[PDB]
Design a protein around this motif. Structure first.
Motif, PDB file in Angstrom:
ATOM      1  N   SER A  95      13.492  13.134 -34.017  1.00 32.39           N
ATOM      2  CA  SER A  95      13.200  12.432 -32.745  1.00 32.39           C
ATOM      3  C   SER A  95      11.659  12.445 -32.652  1.00 32.39           C
ATOM      4  N   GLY A  96      10.959  11.556 -31.983  1.00 30.85           N
ATOM      5  CA  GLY A  96      11.747  10.504 -31.370  1.00 30.85           C
ATOM      6  C   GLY A  96      12.208   9.464 -32.373  1.00 30.85           C
ATOM      7  N   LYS A  97      12.529   8.343 -31.774  1.00 29.61           N
ATOM      8  CA  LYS A  97      13.037   7.118 -32.374  1.00 29.61           C
ATOM      9  C   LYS A  97      11.862   6.467 -33.046  1.00 29.61           C
ATOM     10  N   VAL A  98      11.823   6.114 -34.214  1.00 33.39           N
ATOM     11  CA  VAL A  98      10.634   5.410 -34.771  1.00 33.39           C
ATOM     12  C   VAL A  98      11.106   4.485 -35.890  1.00 33.39           C
ATOM     13  N   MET A  99      10.352   3.414 -36.089  1.00 31.51           N
ATOM     14  CA  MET A  99      10.595   2.449 -37.155  1.00 31.51           C
ATOM     15  C   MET A  99      10.444   3.026 -38.516  1.00 31.51           C
ATOM     16  N   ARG A 100      11.018   2.267 -39.437  1.00 34.31           N
ATOM     17  CA  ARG A 100      10.957   2.506 -40.861  1.00 34.31           C
ATOM     18  C   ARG A 100      11.526   3.875 -41.106  1.00 34.31           C
TER      19      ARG A 100
END
Ligand SMILES: [Zn+2]
Lengths: 6, 274
Positions: free
Chosen positions: A1-6
Protein backbone atom coordinates in the motif's frame (compact mmCIF):
# COMPACT_ATOMS: atom_id res chain seq x y z
CA UNK A 1 0.00 0.00 0.00
CA UNK A 2 -0.70 2.47 -1.06
CA UNK A 3 -2.22 1.91 -4.46
CA UNK A 4 0.24 2.84 -7.20
CA UNK A 5 0.65 2.35 -10.95
CA UNK A 6 2.84 -0.10 -12.70
CA UNK B 1 3.79 -28.34 -16.36
CA UNK B 2 3.76 -27.73 -19.07
CA UNK B 3 0.03 -27.90 -18.15
CA UNK B 4 -2.96 -27.45 -20.38
CA UNK B 5 -6.39 -26.10 -19.48
CA UNK B 6 -7.56 -29.74 -19.53
CA UNK B 7 -4.80 -30.68 -17.04
CA UNK B 8 -6.04 -28.06 -14.60
CA UNK B 9 -9.66 -29.17 -14.97
CA UNK B 10 -8.45 -32.75 -14.14
CA UNK B 11 -6.67 -31.62 -11.01
CA UNK B 12 -9.91 -30.04 -9.89
CA UNK B 13 -11.94 -33.12 -10.80
CA UNK B 14 -9.45 -35.43 -8.98
CA UNK B 15 -9.66 -33.15 -5.95
CA UNK B 16 -5.91 -32.59 -6.14
CA UNK B 17 -6.87 -28.87 -5.95
CA UNK B 18 -9.32 -27.87 -3.24
CA UNK B 19 -8.44 -24.22 -2.35
CA UNK B 20 -8.72 -21.79 -5.27
CA UNK B 21 -7.79 -18.16 -4.92
CA UNK B 22 -9.04 -15.87 -7.71
CA UNK B 23 -7.83 -12.41 -8.81
CA UNK B 24 -10.03 -10.42 -11.21
CA UNK B 25 -10.06 -7.12 -12.98
CA UNK B 26 -12.28 -5.02 -15.21
CA UNK B 27 -12.16 -7.41 -18.13
CA UNK B 28 -14.63 -9.77 -16.39
CA UNK B 29 -17.20 -7.00 -16.38
CA UNK B 30 -16.87 -5.78 -19.96
CA UNK B 31 -19.40 -8.48 -21.15
CA UNK B 32 -21.83 -6.86 -18.68
CA UNK B 33 -21.43 -3.59 -20.65
CA UNK B 34 -19.01 -1.83 -18.26
CA UNK B 35 -15.94 -0.36 -20.11
CA UNK B 36 -12.47 -1.10 -18.69
CA UNK B 37 -9.35 1.14 -19.10
CA UNK B 38 -7.21 -0.75 -21.67
CA UNK B 39 -9.43 -2.38 -24.30
CA UNK B 40 -8.88 -0.82 -27.81
CA UNK B 41 -11.77 1.48 -28.71
CA UNK B 42 -14.11 1.05 -25.75
CA UNK B 43 -11.61 1.45 -22.87
CA UNK B 44 -11.25 4.71 -20.95
CA UNK B 45 -7.83 5.21 -22.68
CA UNK B 46 -9.88 5.85 -25.84
CA UNK B 47 -12.80 7.81 -24.35
CA UNK B 48 -11.25 10.61 -22.30
CA UNK B 49 -13.53 13.29 -23.72
CA UNK B 50 -16.67 11.55 -22.51
CA UNK B 51 -15.58 11.93 -18.87
CA UNK B 52 -13.70 15.16 -19.41
CA UNK B 53 -10.42 13.64 -18.13
CA UNK B 54 -6.74 14.49 -18.95
CA UNK B 55 -5.97 10.77 -18.76
CA UNK B 56 -7.82 7.85 -17.30
CA UNK B 57 -6.17 7.43 -13.91
CA UNK B 58 -7.07 11.06 -12.99
CA UNK B 59 -10.50 9.73 -12.22
CA UNK B 60 -8.95 7.99 -9.20
CA UNK B 61 -6.46 10.66 -8.18
CA UNK B 62 -7.10 12.96 -5.20
CA UNK B 63 -5.61 16.14 -6.55
CA UNK B 64 -7.71 15.92 -9.69
CA UNK B 65 -10.72 14.85 -7.63
CA UNK B 66 -10.55 17.85 -5.32
CA UNK B 67 -10.05 20.22 -8.23
CA UNK B 68 -13.01 18.69 -10.09
CA UNK B 69 -15.02 15.89 -8.57
CA UNK B 70 -17.59 15.72 -11.38
CA UNK B 71 -15.92 13.10 -13.69
CA UNK B 72 -15.64 10.78 -10.73
CA UNK B 73 -19.29 11.27 -9.73
CA UNK B 74 -20.45 10.54 -13.37
CA UNK B 75 -18.76 7.12 -13.09
CA UNK B 76 -20.19 6.67 -9.62
CA UNK B 77 -23.66 7.31 -11.07
CA UNK B 78 -23.16 4.65 -13.78
CA UNK B 79 -21.71 2.15 -11.35
CA UNK B 80 -24.06 2.66 -8.42
CA UNK B 81 -25.98 -0.63 -7.75
CA UNK B 82 -28.96 -1.50 -9.95
CA UNK B 83 -27.59 -0.58 -13.35
CA UNK B 84 -25.30 -3.32 -14.52
CA UNK B 85 -25.81 -7.07 -13.90
CA UNK B 86 -23.27 -9.84 -13.37
CA UNK B 87 -22.54 -11.96 -16.51
CA UNK B 88 -21.53 -15.61 -16.88
CA UNK B 89 -17.96 -15.00 -15.63
CA UNK B 90 -19.39 -13.80 -12.23
CA UNK B 91 -21.81 -16.72 -12.00
CA UNK B 92 -18.92 -19.05 -12.76
CA UNK B 93 -17.12 -17.67 -9.63
CA UNK B 94 -20.41 -17.99 -7.65
CA UNK B 95 -20.57 -21.64 -8.73
CA UNK B 96 -16.98 -22.12 -7.66
CA UNK B 97 -18.01 -20.86 -4.22
CA UNK B 98 -21.17 -23.05 -4.17
CA UNK B 99 -19.05 -26.07 -5.06
CA UNK B 100 -16.68 -25.62 -2.04
CA UNK B 101 -13.65 -24.55 -4.09
CA UNK B 102 -13.33 -20.79 -3.39
CA UNK B 103 -10.81 -19.85 -0.73
CA UNK B 104 -11.07 -16.11 -1.64
CA UNK B 105 -11.86 -13.78 -4.56
CA UNK B 106 -9.68 -10.71 -4.73
CA UNK B 107 -11.08 -8.07 -7.04
CA UNK B 108 -9.87 -4.73 -8.32
CA UNK B 109 -13.41 -3.98 -9.66
CA UNK B 110 -15.61 -1.42 -8.02
CA UNK B 111 -18.86 -2.36 -9.80
CA UNK B 112 -19.99 -4.58 -6.85
CA UNK B 113 -21.02 -7.41 -9.25
CA UNK B 114 -19.26 -10.20 -7.24
CA UNK B 115 -21.61 -9.48 -4.27
CA UNK B 116 -24.64 -9.11 -6.58
CA UNK B 117 -23.88 -12.52 -8.04
CA UNK B 118 -24.35 -13.96 -4.51
CA UNK B 119 -20.77 -14.59 -3.33
CA UNK B 120 -20.75 -13.95 0.56
CA UNK B 121 -18.84 -10.90 1.68
CA UNK B 122 -16.60 -13.15 3.77
CA UNK B 123 -15.27 -14.81 0.57
CA UNK B 124 -14.59 -11.43 -1.14
CA UNK B 125 -11.75 -8.92 -0.91
CA UNK B 126 -12.86 -5.78 -2.66
CA UNK B 127 -9.27 -4.53 -2.81
CA UNK B 128 -9.95 -1.18 -4.42
CA UNK B 129 -13.00 -0.39 -2.34
CA UNK B 130 -16.74 -0.14 -2.76
CA UNK B 131 -19.70 2.18 -3.41
CA UNK B 132 -21.54 0.50 -0.40
CA UNK B 133 -20.11 3.16 1.87
CA UNK B 134 -18.68 6.68 1.79
CA UNK B 135 -16.56 8.95 4.03
CA UNK B 136 -16.45 12.75 4.50
CA UNK B 137 -13.15 13.89 2.99
CA UNK B 138 -12.85 16.62 5.69
CA UNK B 139 -14.17 15.18 8.97
CA UNK B 140 -13.92 11.46 8.18
CA UNK B 141 -17.56 10.67 9.21
CA UNK B 142 -18.70 7.37 7.58
CA UNK B 143 -21.98 7.09 5.65
CA UNK B 144 -23.92 4.24 4.10
CA UNK B 145 -23.86 4.36 0.30
CA UNK B 146 -27.65 4.94 0.17
CA UNK B 147 -27.28 8.25 2.09
CA UNK B 148 -25.62 9.94 -0.90
CA UNK B 149 -27.51 8.06 -3.61
CA UNK B 150 -30.07 10.81 -4.30
CA UNK B 151 -27.35 13.40 -4.86
CA UNK B 152 -25.35 10.95 -6.98
CA UNK B 153 -28.41 10.19 -9.24
CA UNK B 154 -29.12 13.93 -9.56
CA UNK B 155 -25.59 14.91 -10.54
CA UNK B 156 -25.11 16.89 -7.30
CA UNK B 157 -21.78 16.43 -5.46
CA UNK B 158 -22.68 14.94 -2.10
CA UNK B 159 -21.82 17.17 0.89
CA UNK B 160 -21.41 16.28 4.61
CA UNK B 161 -24.29 17.35 6.92
CA UNK B 162 -21.79 17.97 9.73
CA UNK B 163 -18.99 20.06 8.08
CA UNK B 164 -20.15 20.52 4.39
CA UNK B 165 -17.05 18.60 3.19
CA UNK B 166 -17.28 16.53 -0.07
CA UNK B 167 -18.52 12.99 0.72
CA UNK B 168 -16.49 10.50 -1.24
CA UNK B 169 -17.61 6.89 -1.77
CA UNK B 170 -15.09 4.42 -0.39
CA UNK B 171 -13.09 3.76 -3.53
CA UNK B 172 -9.31 3.48 -2.98
CA UNK B 173 -7.59 6.29 -4.91
CA UNK B 174 -3.93 6.33 -6.07
CA UNK B 175 -1.63 6.63 -3.11
CA UNK B 176 -4.22 5.55 -0.57
CA UNK B 177 -3.85 2.27 1.54
CA UNK B 178 -5.92 -0.70 0.48
CA UNK B 179 -8.59 -1.87 2.96
CA UNK B 180 -7.66 -3.91 5.97
CA UNK B 181 -9.28 -7.07 4.45
CA UNK B 182 -6.57 -6.95 1.81
CA UNK B 183 -4.27 -8.25 4.62
CA UNK B 184 -5.98 -11.63 4.32
CA UNK B 185 -3.53 -12.19 1.44
CA UNK B 186 -0.86 -13.05 4.04
CA UNK B 187 -2.68 -16.24 5.05
CA UNK B 188 -4.74 -16.82 1.77
CA UNK B 189 -1.90 -16.96 -0.75
CA UNK B 190 0.35 -19.59 1.01
CA UNK B 191 -2.75 -21.73 1.51
CA UNK B 192 -3.96 -21.65 -2.12
CA UNK B 193 -3.42 -24.80 -4.23
CA UNK B 194 -4.63 -23.04 -7.39
CA UNK B 195 -4.58 -19.40 -8.62
CA UNK B 196 -6.97 -18.20 -11.24
CA UNK B 197 -6.42 -14.73 -12.85
CA UNK B 198 -9.16 -13.23 -15.03
CA UNK B 199 -9.58 -10.08 -17.02
CA UNK B 200 -6.82 -7.81 -15.61
CA UNK B 201 -3.75 -6.02 -16.96
CA UNK B 202 -1.92 -6.52 -13.66
CA UNK B 203 -0.80 -2.88 -13.88
CA UNK B 204 -1.71 -1.69 -10.39
CA UNK B 205 0.23 -2.55 -7.19
CA UNK B 206 0.21 -3.96 -4.62
CA UNK B 207 -2.66 -6.01 -6.09
CA UNK B 208 -0.62 -7.12 -9.14
CA UNK B 209 2.32 -8.70 -7.26
CA UNK B 210 -0.05 -11.06 -5.44
CA UNK B 211 0.43 -13.36 -8.47
CA UNK B 212 3.92 -13.93 -7.04
CA UNK B 213 2.76 -14.94 -3.65
CA UNK B 214 1.53 -18.48 -4.33
CA UNK B 215 3.95 -21.40 -3.77
CA UNK B 216 6.08 -22.39 -6.76
CA UNK B 217 4.23 -25.69 -7.30
CA UNK B 218 0.83 -23.96 -7.52
CA UNK B 219 -0.53 -23.67 -11.12
CA UNK B 220 -1.57 -20.15 -12.17
CA UNK B 221 -4.27 -20.06 -14.80
CA UNK B 222 -4.73 -16.80 -16.68
CA UNK B 223 -7.85 -16.26 -18.72
CA UNK B 224 -7.43 -12.95 -20.53
CA UNK B 225 -7.35 -11.24 -23.92
CA UNK B 226 -3.53 -11.15 -23.66
CA UNK B 227 -0.62 -12.39 -21.57
CA UNK B 228 0.10 -9.97 -18.74
CA UNK B 229 2.14 -9.00 -15.71
CA UNK B 230 4.52 -10.95 -13.48
CA UNK B 231 3.09 -13.82 -15.56
CA UNK B 232 4.34 -12.63 -19.01
CA UNK B 233 7.91 -11.91 -17.87
CA UNK B 234 8.33 -14.04 -14.74
CA UNK B 235 6.95 -17.26 -16.19
CA UNK B 236 6.78 -20.43 -14.13
CA UNK B 237 6.53 -24.05 -15.21
CA UNK B 238 2.91 -24.60 -14.05
CA UNK B 239 1.44 -21.36 -15.55
CA UNK B 240 -1.37 -21.77 -18.07
CA UNK B 241 -2.68 -19.04 -20.36
CA UNK B 242 -6.04 -19.29 -21.99
CA UNK B 243 -6.07 -16.22 -24.32
CA UNK B 244 -9.24 -14.99 -25.88
CA UNK B 245 -12.55 -13.70 -24.74
CA UNK B 246 -12.89 -14.19 -20.94
CA UNK B 247 -16.34 -15.74 -21.14
CA UNK B 248 -15.17 -18.20 -23.89
CA UNK B 249 -12.21 -19.31 -21.76
CA UNK B 250 -14.53 -19.73 -18.73
CA UNK B 251 -17.09 -21.68 -20.85
CA UNK B 252 -14.34 -24.01 -22.00
CA UNK B 253 -13.16 -24.59 -18.38
CA UNK B 254 -16.77 -25.07 -17.15
CA UNK B 255 -17.30 -27.72 -19.82
CA UNK B 256 -14.05 -29.60 -18.97
CA UNK B 257 -15.12 -29.48 -15.32
CA UNK B 258 -18.52 -31.06 -15.99
CA UNK B 259 -20.48 -27.98 -14.86
CA UNK B 260 -22.25 -26.56 -17.93
CA UNK B 261 -25.92 -27.35 -17.26
CA UNK B 262 -25.63 -26.36 -13.62
CA UNK B 263 -23.99 -23.02 -14.62
CA UNK B 264 -26.71 -22.31 -17.20
CA UNK B 265 -29.46 -23.08 -14.65
CA UNK B 266 -27.76 -20.85 -12.05
CA UNK B 267 -27.52 -17.97 -14.54
CA UNK B 268 -31.14 -18.25 -15.60
CA UNK B 269 -32.47 -18.22 -12.09
CA UNK B 270 -30.17 -15.40 -10.80
CA UNK B 271 -30.38 -12.87 -13.64
CA UNK B 272 -34.15 -13.31 -13.94
CA UNK B 273 -34.79 -11.85 -10.54
CA UNK B 274 -34.66 -8.02 -10.32
ZN1 LIG C 1 -17.78 16.14 7.33
Amino acid sequence: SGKVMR
Amino acid sequence: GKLSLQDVAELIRARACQRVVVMVGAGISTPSGIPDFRSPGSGLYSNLQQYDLPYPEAIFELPFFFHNPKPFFTLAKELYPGNYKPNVTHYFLRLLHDKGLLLRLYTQNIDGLERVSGIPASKLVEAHGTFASATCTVCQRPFPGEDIRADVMADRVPRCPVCTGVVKPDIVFFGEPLPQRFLLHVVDFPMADLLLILGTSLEVEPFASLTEAVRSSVPRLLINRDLVGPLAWHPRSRDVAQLGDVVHGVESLVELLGWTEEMRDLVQRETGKL
